[PDB]
């Protein structure tokens, strides 16, 4: 069915332009509906930014009207957000939507002068059930995603929220509860993805 997929950098420098692409699948953006950009600030506040309609008409939130542009390409089935002269206050998770019903997955854009950095991934090694995990350290900006055994192992998984360390780099752990009898015969690998830097790190977690 209709899905919306966002792409663009997770990091933009202060005073420069933020650009995001929404790729629409299984629906033509010219056929109907209104195609929105909405953003969520840290702390959960949602703000409607603007739309482009089925016919290419625009409507922008007055708060942004001087800085925003929403454009489209009908033959690639994409529409695009541009926001000029970003400040630290534009750091948000950006969503594209069709009406109110269909949302893209969201992309966090951090406004910062710092460079991207991929994570270091360290095993949390188990010492009837046992917990094990991965310490995911020293990355910027958010987010990482963590899966286990390529998404085959989902139940009993806690992936904690990122905390910004004093160094200016984020850190988190992902843990999973696992049968203690399976520790010698089953393989547990954490798959870490850091989209902002296009880095994937896979780490095998072995008993000590």
């Amino acid at each position: 069915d209709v899905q919306l997929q966002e792409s663009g950098p997770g990091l933009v420098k202060p005073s420069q332009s933020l650009s995001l692409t929404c790729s629409v699948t299984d629906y033509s953006i010219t056929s109907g509906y209104y195609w929105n950009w909405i953003r969520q600030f840290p702390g959960n506040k949602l703000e409607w930014m603007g739309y482009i309609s089925y016919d290419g008409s625009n409507n922008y939130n007055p708060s942004l009207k001087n800085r925003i542009s929403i454009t489209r390409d009908p033959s690639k089935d994409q529409f695009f957000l541009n926001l000029n002269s970003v400040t630290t206050e534009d750091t948000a998770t950006y969503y594209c939507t069709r009406g109110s019903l269909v949302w893209g997955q969201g992309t966090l854009v951090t406004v910062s002068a710092a460079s991207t950095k991929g994570p270091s991934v360290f095993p949390l090694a188990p010492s009837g059930t046992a917990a094990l995990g991965c310490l995911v350290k020293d990355y910027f900006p958010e987010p990482v995603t963590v899966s286990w055994n390529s998404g085959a192992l989902t139940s009993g998984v806690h992936t904690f929220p990122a905390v910004l360390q004093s160094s200016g780099l984020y850190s988190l752990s992902s843990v999973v509860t696992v049968p203690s009898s399976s520790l010698g015969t089953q393989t547990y690998i954490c798959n870490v993805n850091h989209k902002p830097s296009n880095t994937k790190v896979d780490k095998k977690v072995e008993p000590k």
């Binding site: 506040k45 949602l46 939130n61 270091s120 806690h158 929220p161 360390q165 509860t177």
Partner: protein, 203 residues
């Protein structure tokens, strides 16, 4: 601009019982029809538009009623006006399930050899699936109480069992790690008759 207000930042509810989330608009949302949407946002996910859920209200005062709340209803509930542009949201209301006490399973993890090549040692204490959210974690290095070099992170309420989990991370230099032997995490929580200590000896 229409302003949308949700006066409760959160609402507690016993599972099986019912709950009301309230929302107000600065300007009437009628034109017979009422231009008010409700969204649920689960942690990590985009907002989703909303038989147990029902909407009611007049032109400036609205109610989302969740009948027989399940553990799976947790998350943040937002109202949105779609009467006039710009569309505007309320600040959201977190639905928190109040369940029975549940004590944490505690686990300790030493620094990995890989990390030790860097000059930093991270020691991790895990507290799984406990209730309520409040818990005390204490670190001791050779029985000396650690201060200022640990950080706690806690998950949002679990969708399945209404619990929380918590990681405590002790950050030390490699040199400081190599000079000491015994590393312990002492956990105090409502469901434990006696504080639980988990520990390891370096190497």
């Amino acid at each position: 601009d229409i302003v949308m207000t949700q006066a409760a930042p959160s609402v507690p509810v016993t599972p099986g019982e019912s709950v009301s989330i309230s929302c107000r608009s600065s300007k009437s949302l009628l034109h017979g029809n009422t231009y008010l949407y409700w969204f649920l946002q689960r942690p990590g996910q985009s907002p989703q538009l909303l038989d147990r859920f029902s909407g009611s209200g007049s032109g400036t005062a609205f109610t989302l009623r969740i009948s027989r709340v399940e553990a799976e209803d947790v998350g943040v509930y937002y109202c949105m006006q779609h009467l006039e542009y710009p569309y505007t949201f309320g600040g959201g209301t977190r639905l928190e399930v109040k369940r029975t006490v549940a004590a944490p399973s505690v686990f300790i993890f030493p620094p990995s050899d890989e990390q030790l090549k860097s000059g930093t040692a991270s020691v991790v204490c895990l507290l799984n699936n406990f209730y309520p959210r409040e818990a005390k974690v204490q670190w001791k290095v050779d029985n000396a109480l650690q201060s200022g070099n640990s950080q706690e992170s806690v998950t949002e309420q679990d969708s399945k069992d209404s619990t929380y989990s918590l990681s405590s991370t002790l950050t030390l230099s490699k040199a400081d790690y190599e000079k000491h032997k015994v590393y312990a995490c002492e956990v105090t929580h409502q469901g434990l008759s006696s504080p639980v200590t988990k520990s390891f000896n370096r190497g």
